[PDB]
RNA sequence: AGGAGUGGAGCCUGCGGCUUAAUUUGACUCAACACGGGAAACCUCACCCGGCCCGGACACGGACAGGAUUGACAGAUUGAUA
RNA sequence: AGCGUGUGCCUACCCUACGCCGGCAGGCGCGGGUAACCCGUUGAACCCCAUUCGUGAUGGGGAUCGGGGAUUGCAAUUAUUCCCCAUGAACGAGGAAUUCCCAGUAAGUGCGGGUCAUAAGCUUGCGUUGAUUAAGUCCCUGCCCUUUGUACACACCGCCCGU
């Protein structure tokens with residue numbers, strides 16, 4: 001089945017709030033500024049705004065490749 | 080949607096209330112056309128904050 | 137044995153079966169629209185959720 | 192003079208099954224029996240029966256202690272010594288035939304009756 | 316408020332200490348001079364406890380410790 | 388903490404395969420969602436990851452109710468030596484796909 | 485200038501007292517007292533009575549495949565099939 | 567009439583039309599709704615029109631108790647809640663004192679939301695009926711300014727004198 005629009009919008013807001021809190025705690029050291037979630041039926045893109053992107057990406061892109069993993073693990077939507 | 084809560088984290092002081100409010104707006108459009116043209120026009124429509132649902136009755 | 141006794145008491149309804157999704161507190165819980173937050177956490181995260189004060 | 196529960200004496204009550212006893216009881220006891228008894232109540236009944244079987248012909252059975260304050264007094268319990276927990280101590284109760292249909296917790300009081308003293312300074 | 320101690324109960328409830336048995340494998344088998352082996356302890360009829368899982372020779376019962384199966 | 392060796396093997400295999408671990412901090416959860424058909428309680432995962440963290444093998448973060456764990460290089464070496472994995476095996480994180 | 489009142493009655497709920505094994509606790513003029521979103525049968529629970537569990541990471545030492553340790557049928561025991 | 571809610575990650579617990587059974591609380595079936603779609607044209611209560619009663623603690627009031635029935639729950643006793651017979655207390659407008667209010671307002675009357683397995687004498691909102699009085703003042707209470715006096719500055723809950 002499906003849920004009502006009220007619950008859907010509330011769930012989207014709660015998801016964005018939790019994502020922002022997690023990103024804050026993770027990337028405070030890197031000057032984390034904000035998060036922007038653009039939802040597309042193909043893929044859901046997440047833009048991370050921070051002062052420096054070198055630390056967020058990590059070496060060879062390891063660290064960011066970790067984050068997009070745990071997010072997929074946390075909220076459960078498919079790989 | 081409305082949520083009325085108390086401002087104070089505890090139970091001390093004047094009884095003051097916060098009234099939070101969320102508004103949801105909804106539009107409907109009808110089209111007599113084949114699927115392909117609808118997807119053609121819809122592809123551009125992607126906008127941040129707007130949920131678009133296409134159904135064939 | 138201990139395996140049967142531990143956590144045996146049913147928790148399918150009541151205050152003991154519900155808690156805040158942020159701080160795990162069972163008091164002052166908001167269940168409307170499936171928020172499942174205590175009032176303090178909700179007041180902290182209302183702007184992020186999308187609730188605006190107009191009056 | 193002879194005891195009768197809603198026109199039925201003790202012997203017929205002992206002969207009756209649970210379904211027959213449901214119609215004699217009140218609404219709450221009937222609903223409780225219809226929902227059924229769990230393992231702990233059956234264990235208590237078994238212990239009471241075991242204790243009553245081993246009693247001397249002229250002596251009372253050994254006291255059986257329990258925390259089950261919501262147990263319904265069945266006609267098979269008449270004549271048994273039950274210690275009922277009140278949160279602090281086990282109070283000894285002998286089941287009488289006029290207790291049929293009540294709970295065990297109704298016969299072990301959970302508080303001390305109040306005897307008032309002189310009111311303090313904070314009373315006006 | 317400050318916590319009161321009130322430390323007085325049954326003197327000491329002791330924890331069960333498991334018995335130390337030296338070479339418990341040996342007593343399961345008996346040996347003749349010819350070199351034969353006879354299994355003193357019965358073997359449980361369960362699936363998992365079929366070959367090496369022996370039972371318990373209690374004074375009035377047989378008990379498998381791995382699946383709680385009991386026989387007279 | 389006492390637990391069967393196969394639970395530890397499964398947890399370590401999953402951690403080395405993915406490179407990260409997520410838990411909900413629920414000691415009464417009957418089984419970990421990710422570790423299904425292996426019957427691993429969530430408490431075992433929590434305690435195993437805590438033991439790994441105390442030795443520096445994993446890095447930990449906590450968010451809103453959840454534990455997040457990332458694998459360290461020394462943790463990679465420890466898991467590779469523990470599971471007897473060939474030196475040609477790396478977690479999916481270390482592959483820039 | 486007035487209206488509806490409260491203070492009087494019965495009852496419902498909070499706060500003092502007094503009892504209790506415990507009757508958990510914060511707050512005391514406005515700016516404490518149907519307030520802590522506090523309408524508690526269990527949970528909530530923070531109080532009292534009694535009984536299990538370790539969910540005491542990690543480092544060092546001891547002991548250990550001639551076994552470190554784990555669980556458990558019956559009878560006893562227990563409020564209890566801890 | 568109006569504001570709103572409705573099948574839920576964990577999480578078990580939704581709103582209900584229609585048919586039958588029961589006197590009632592309720593029980594059986596069988597459908598709709600993830601909602602301007604179904605409950606729902608939300609047949610609300612006060613109010614309106616008739617009937618009975620007739621200044622009698624009265625057919626006002628409904629406290630306290632007895633006996634039965636049913637629902638929620640793992641569990642209802644120290645009565646969870648609900649229904650039916652029976653019982654029928656103070657109370658005849660309230661001392662000193664004291665609260666809120668200037669128009670769709672005060673008051674009367676119901677209905678939603680929160681709490682909620684069971685659930686409103688509380689709160690937060692919504693309608694419906696709908697006024698008397700006033701368009702002023704500094705008398706009471708309190709708070710601001712200006713002038714003025716001070717031996718106060720931890721600021722009158724101050725400082726300070728003599729037995």
Ligand SMILES: [Mg+2]
Pocket residue numbers: none
């Ligand atoms: Mg009145």
Ligand SMILES: [Mg+2]
Pocket residue numbers: 490
């Ligand atoms: Mg009055």
Ligand SMILES: [Mg+2]
Pocket residue numbers: none
């Ligand atoms: Mg009064």
Ligand SMILES: [Mg+2]
Pocket residue numbers: 499517
């Ligand atoms: Mg008072």
Ligand SMILES: [Mg+2]
Pocket residue numbers: 508509530
């Ligand atoms: Mg306390």
Ligand SMILES: [Mg+2]
Pocket residue numbers: none
């Ligand atoms: Mg003021």
Ligand SMILES: [Mg+2]
Pocket residue numbers: 522
């Ligand atoms: Mg209170």
Ligand SMILES: [Mg+2]
Pocket residue numbers: none
């Ligand atoms: Mg209650």
Ligand SMILES: [Mg+2]
Pocket residue numbers: 525641
């Ligand atoms: Mg009880």
Ligand SMILES: [Mg+2]
Pocket residue numbers: 526
């Ligand atoms: Mg209990």
Ligand SMILES: [Mg+2]
Pocket residue numbers: none
């Ligand atoms: Mg309690």
Ligand SMILES: [Mg+2]
Pocket residue numbers: none
């Ligand atoms: Mg241990």
Ligand SMILES: [Mg+2]
Pocket residue numbers: none
């Ligand atoms: Mg009368």
Ligand SMILES: [Mg+2]
Pocket residue numbers: none
């Ligand atoms: Mg009368």
Ligand SMILES: [Mg+2]
Pocket residue numbers: none
């Ligand atoms: Mg009765």
Ligand SMILES: [Mg+2]
Pocket residue numbers: 644
């Ligand atoms: Mg009591």
